[PDB]
Design an enzyme around this catalytic site. Structure first.
Site, short mmCIF file in Angstrom:
data_model
loop_
_atom_site.label_atom_id
_atom_site.label_comp_id
_atom_site.label_asym_id
_atom_site.label_seq_id
_atom_site.Cartn_x
_atom_site.Cartn_y
_atom_site.Cartn_z
N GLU A 11 14.37 68.62 46.14
CA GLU A 11 15.60 68.00 45.69
C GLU A 11 15.88 66.65 46.28
OE1 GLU A 11 16.86 71.26 43.14
OE2 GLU A 11 17.46 69.14 43.50
N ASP A 20 21.25 63.32 38.33
CA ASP A 20 20.16 64.23 38.44
C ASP A 20 19.19 63.97 37.27
OD1 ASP A 20 21.32 67.70 37.52
OD2 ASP A 20 20.76 66.02 36.22
#
Length: 164
Positions: A11, A20
């Site tokens: 991540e 994202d």
């Protein structure tokens, strides 16, 4: 290697609001804020989650605190989930980490939708499941991370992340 290091690799860490892969407003270590297009919707969810006026920016400490909550909520989610629990129970420690990774990324609901794959993992048919998991929007959209996860399920070792 542990679940926290694994996800930190997958991540990243960002201290300022960001988008994202999916275009959604995220912060920290994969912490989804809102699927809403409004940056203001984002800073709002943000301050609410942190308990301070942050104005789009958080500290390392805040980012980790959020990471702790998310991982914990991912594990209890699996544990309370009737589709997920049986699979988790049946797995060894490393493959356990892999399912946690998926739940963290795609939520409980999305992972429980992988019926066939779940069935194969439970039956310990590793190669079969690896090939089935790859036939998904998940794999197509984030192939390097998906492959790392898939490899973890296929082998039961941290090889894929040992690299990284």
């Amino acid at each position: 290697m542990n679940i926290f290091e694994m996800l930190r690799i997958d991540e990243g860490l960002r201290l300022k609001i960001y988008k994202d892969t999916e275009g959604y407003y995220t912060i920290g270590i994969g912490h989804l804020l809102t699927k809403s297009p409004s940056l203001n919707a984002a800073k709002s969810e943000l301050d609410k989650a942190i308990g301070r006026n942050c104005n789009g920016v958080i500290t390392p400490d805040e980012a980790e605190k959020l990471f702790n909550q998310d991982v914990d909520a991912a594990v209890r989610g699996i544990l309370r989930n009737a589709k997920l629990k049986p699979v988790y129970d049946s797995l060894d420690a490393v493959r356990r980490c892999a399912l946690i990774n998926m739940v963290f990324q795609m939520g409980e609901t999305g992972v429980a939708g992988f019926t066939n794959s779940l069935r194969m993992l439970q039956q310990k048919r590793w190669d079969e499941a690896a090939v089935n998991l790859a036939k998904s929007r998940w794999y197509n959209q984030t192939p390097n991370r998906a492959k790392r996860v898939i490899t973890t399920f296929r082998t039961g070792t941290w090889d894929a992340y040992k690299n990284l």
